[PDB]
């Protein structure tokens, strides 16, 4: 019966909405914004206008380190801890790391080997330095493998950096950390071979039980310059503290039972009844929904089952708490759950056919999809043809066409009217205005109207057939 | 011997091979 599947789908939707409301808690956005504005918007010192977001050289990084970073990290109340806003407790000690490359890992032409005595390659695993340097006494001057450091790859902006390198664990007090960074700056630590630098720490904020993991990355490309990026991620690792948490756990169990019911219902039908089963487009939606749901359940089980990093940190609290993997898996779980919710909500169209107007529109869309695909092939071919031209012509000067996907995004933004002409115009006096005007005309005057022609024709034909079949039988 | 030395020591990508095989596959798919 249709009523049974309708009511079970509504129950599934209700429990999904409850889960989404629970996971998206009270305003964590304000937590994140306060942390972000404290660490990213304050100028590096009282006389410069540069912050972390606008770093431009290697000396600016040193100004930021022994500067705004220590100002934000250490707040005055025997070796008392530090509360960042008098509320956020700094967990353990922060850590600083760098990834380097090797001298002589490059190829200097023989005719230039007289005014060029050193070439450093771009970052790659097969080219990173592993030898001691400088005052080779501590861990900041000695390579440590990824397994001895409990690290993982990062996928920054320029490349994907490994979890090894040269590291220091800082101190719990402002004075000792300041001395450590001054010593690092004196005996030069960042040189022309440096390729990346990481700063990592975490805070707790016991008021609302929610950890925050902060990572700041600075990339030094081989061609010179500085590229900063940041990441603030809130986590919940002590779930069961209040009654609402138990309610959420019960709802999660209900969700698992619903997923089991849906998969067993799927397999009971796919077995013998209708072996093809794929010419519906609703069965494909059901199978993708259950696949995403089981993937999310697996990720959640794999992630919450082990919190041994937290347990090990609770033994002694003078060490570095390593929470990067937990944040990575939290982000993955969030993405999967958001997509699953979107598709579950889309699945609602299967039941809105209660009169003669809903069925008309659904039939129109179904009969229009085929030739919409047929013309969308041409539309996308022309779109990519414009995108590659923009990439090849403006991709070295404009920063809005620097990468192919960025060209696609800029072309989509042009349709909305969010274009900045002040930089595209002088990138090429000819072929700059030509590209823009032809794109606008052939996108709004031509290709936007063929979709209308097709849709309008199929809708009118559907209505004509439905009105000629009816009132004539 | 030895004659099969292990390839892939780095991560850079060569576009010539990918482009030519893509062309050679698309032409078959249309033919
Ligand atoms: C780098 O290596 C070249 C030769 O490979 C050498 O001449 C140069 O002194 C080296 N520089 C450093 C800083 O090690
Ligand atoms: C390196 O570490 C040792 C450890 O005792 C210390 O004595 C020495 O001063 C350090 N080197 C520098 C340049 O500070
Ligand atoms: C990596 O994890 C192990 C497990 O407790 C720990 O003993 C070790 O100190 C960690 N590595 C570093 C560099 O702290
Ligand atoms: Ca089905």
How are the elements arranged and paired?
This is part of a larger assembly, with chains A (473 residues) and B (31 residues).
Chain A: H1 2-23, H2 28-40, H3 58-73, E1 95-100, H4 146-149, E2 166-169, H5 174-186, E3 194-203, E4 211-219, E5 227-235, H6 243-270, H7 282-304, H8 308-315, H9 324-346, H10 356-394, H11 404-416, H12 421-427, H13 433-469
Chain B: H1 15-30
Bound molecules: 2-acetamido-2-deoxy-beta-D-glucopyranose (NAG) (3 copies) and calcium ion.
Motif (Selectivity filter) (chain A): 416-418
Extracellular side (chain A): 24-243, 302-327, 395-406, 422-429
Transmembrane segments (chain A): 2-23, 244-264, 281-301, 328-348, 373-394, 430-450
Helix content of chain A: 40-55%
Largest sheet of chain B: none
User: What gross morphology of chain B would you assign?
Assistant: elongated
Query: What compounds sit in this structure?
Result: 2-acetamido-2-deoxy-beta-D-glucopyranose, calcium ion
Number of helices of chain B: 1
Distance between the termini of chain B: 43 Å
Question: How far apart lie the N and C ends of chain A?
Answer: 29 Å
């Amino acid at each position: 019966s249709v009523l049974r599947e309708l009511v079970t789908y509504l129950l599934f939707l209700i429990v999904l909405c409850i889960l989404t409301y629970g996971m998206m808690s009270s305003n964590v956005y304000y937590y994140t914004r306060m942390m972000s504005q404290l660490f990213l918007d304050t100028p590096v010192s009282k006389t410069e206008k540069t912050n972390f977001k606008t770093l431009s050289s290697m000396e600016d990084f040193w100004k930021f380190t022994e500067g705004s970073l220590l100002d934000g990290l250490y707040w005055k109340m025997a070796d008392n801890r530090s509360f960042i806003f008098y509320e956020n407790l700094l967990l353990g000690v922060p850590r600083i790391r760098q990834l380097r490359v090797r001298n002589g890992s490059c190829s200097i032409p023989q005719d230039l080997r007289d005014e060029i005595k050193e070439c450093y390659d771009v970052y790659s695993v097969s080219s990173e330095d592993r030898a001691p340097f400088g005052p080779r006494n501590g861990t900041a001057w000695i390579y440590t493998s990824e397994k001895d450091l409990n690290g993982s790859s990062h996928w920054g902006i320029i490349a994907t950096y490994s979890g090894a390198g040269y590291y220091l664990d800082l101190s719990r007090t402002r004075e000792e950390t300041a001395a450590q960074v001054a010593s690092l700056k004196k005996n030069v630590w960042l040189d022309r071979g440096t390729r990346a630098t990481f700063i990592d720490f975490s805070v707790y904020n016991a008021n609302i039980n929610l950890f925050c993991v902060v990572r700041l990355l600075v990339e030094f490309p081989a061609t010179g310059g500085v590229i900063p990026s940041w990441q603030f991620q809130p986590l919940k690792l002590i779930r069961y503290v209040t009654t609402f948490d138990f309610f959420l756990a019960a709802c999660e169990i209900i969700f698992c039972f619903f997923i089991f019911y849906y998969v067993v219902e799927e397999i009971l039908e796919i077995r013998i009844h209708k072996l093809h089963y794929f010419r519906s487009f609703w069965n494909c939606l059901d199978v993708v929904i259950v696949v995403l749901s089981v993937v999310a359940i697996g990720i959640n089980i794999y992630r919450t089952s082990n919190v041994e990093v937290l347990l090990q940190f609770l033994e002694d609290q003078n060490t570095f708490p390593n929470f990067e993997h937990l944040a990575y898996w939290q982000i993955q779980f969030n993405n999967i759950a958001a997509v699953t919710v979107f598709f579950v909500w889309i699945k609602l169209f299967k039941f809105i056919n209660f009169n003669r107007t809903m069925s008309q529109l659904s039939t129109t869309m179904s009969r229009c999809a085929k030739d919409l695909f047929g013309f969308a092939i041409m539309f996308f071919i022309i779109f990519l043809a414009y995108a590659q031209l923009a990439y090849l012509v403006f991709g070295t000067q404009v920063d809005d066409f620097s990468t192919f996907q960025e060209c696609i995004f800029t072309q989509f933004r042009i349709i909305l009217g969010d274009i900045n002409f002040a930089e595209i115009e002088e990138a090429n006096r000819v072929l700059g205005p030509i590209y823009f005007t032809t794109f606008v005309f052939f996108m709004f005057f031509i290709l936007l109207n063929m979709f209308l022609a097709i849709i309008n024709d199929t809708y009118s034909e559907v209505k004509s057939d439905l009105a000629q079949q009816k009132a004539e039988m | 011997h030895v004659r099969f030395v292990f390839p892939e020591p780095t991560a850079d990508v060569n576009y010539i091979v990918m482009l030519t095989c893509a062309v050679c596959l698309v032409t078959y798919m249309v033919m």
